[PDB]
Structure 1
Amino acid sequence: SQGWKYFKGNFYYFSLIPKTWYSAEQFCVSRNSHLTSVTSESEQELLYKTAGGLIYWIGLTKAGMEGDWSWVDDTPFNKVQSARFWIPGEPNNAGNNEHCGNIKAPSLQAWNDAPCDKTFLFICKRPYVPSEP
């Protein structure tokens, strides 16, 4: 597929069709990828600038017993270093039912919690694995 943008050792797909969070993950896995994690300011900047005004699912979901946030790609979640990327006042767990996260605002403070069963465009991340000629 076209549509995979390179950045710092990964490729990033910004979908054209909207899915629920899990259906989006399943499309990523079928493409040897996962909904993206975000572990730096420069990655966050890529995603929000590319996103423009459109809302995209990323790999953020609740998991374990205390519903701590987690990344579907299994990156260990760093709550300290992730606090800077939430919209102010998010996560707000609107109606006690917002257990997945998307990029919503055009700022490094971009993430919002939303219900997993809601449909949005999504971002996949696929590793690049070079090899010496």
Structure 2
Amino acid sequence: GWKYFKGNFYYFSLIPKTWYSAEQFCVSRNSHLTSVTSESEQEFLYKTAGGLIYWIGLTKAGMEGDWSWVDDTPFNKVQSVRFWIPGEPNNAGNNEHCGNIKAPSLQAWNDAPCDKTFLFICKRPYVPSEPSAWS
């Protein structure tokens, strides 16, 4: 049930998991919880989500607590401000270290406790099968 958009395939889950058990599910399928890198991707994701909440690849990294992507895409703080619900991330209860798509809007993301169970979205690039490019 992977959906295709601009060079990547996406899996919207049918069963909810904690953030980390969602990521392990993605990894078992050669993917990761999704990063979000453009307005058009954010639009594809929140529209497809259809008002349900889904874990995405947002999680804290470093001692400063900077947001990061689990698929190792460098996190662009400046260009991601436009993507959080107003007021977020708010670290409610000093315990919200993972992020989801919550609101069906370009301003969609919420920080939530990593141990909460939600549906989730994996991403993986299309990688053609081709003979070795070394030679």
Structure 2 Cα separation of the partners of residues 99 and 131 of structure 1: 37
Look up the match of 1:10. 8
Gaps of 5+ in 1: none
Structure 2 Cα separation of the partners of residues 109 and 101 of structure 1: 13
Q: Displacement of 1:44 after TM fit?
A: 0.2
Structure 2 Cα separation of the partners of residues 19 and 61 of structure 1: 15
Q: Deviations 1:23-61 (Å, cap 9, x if unpaired)?
A: 000000000000000000000000000001100000000
Q: Secondary structure of 2:111's partner?
A: strand
Gaps of 5+ in 2: none
Q: Deviations 1:85-116 (Å, cap 9, x if unpaired)?
A: 00000001100000000000010000000000
Look up the match of 1:68. 66
Q: Deviations 1:55-100 (Å, cap 9, x if unpaired)?
A: 0000000011111000000000010000000000000110000000
Q: Secondary structure of 1:124's partner?
A: strand
Q: Secondary structure of 1:126's partner?
A: strand
RMSD, matched Cα: 1.2
Q: Secondary structure of 2:123's partner?
A: strand
Q: Secondary structure of 2:11's partner?
A: strand
Q: Determine what percentage of the aligned residue pairs are the same residue.
A: 98
Structure 2 Cα separation of the partners of residues 14 and 105 of structure 1: 16
Q: Secondary structure of 1:61's partner?
A: strand
Q: Displacement of 1:131 after TM fit?
A: 5.5
Q: Displacement of 1:129 after TM fit?
A: 1.4
The alignment's TM-score, normalised by the length of structure 1, stands at: 0.96
Aligned length: 131
Structure 2 Cα separation of the partners of residues 10 and 77 of structure 1: 18
Q: Secondary structure of 1:84's partner?
A: helix
Between structure 1 and structure 2, the one with the greater Rg is 2
Q: 2:35 aligns with which of 29, 34, 37?
A: 37
Q: Displacement of 1:130 after TM fit?
A: 2.9
Post-superposition, which runs of at least 4 consecutive aligned residues in structure 1 deviate over 2 A? 130-133
Q: Deviations 1:1-33 (Å, cap 9, x if unpaired)?
A: xx1000110000000000000000000000000
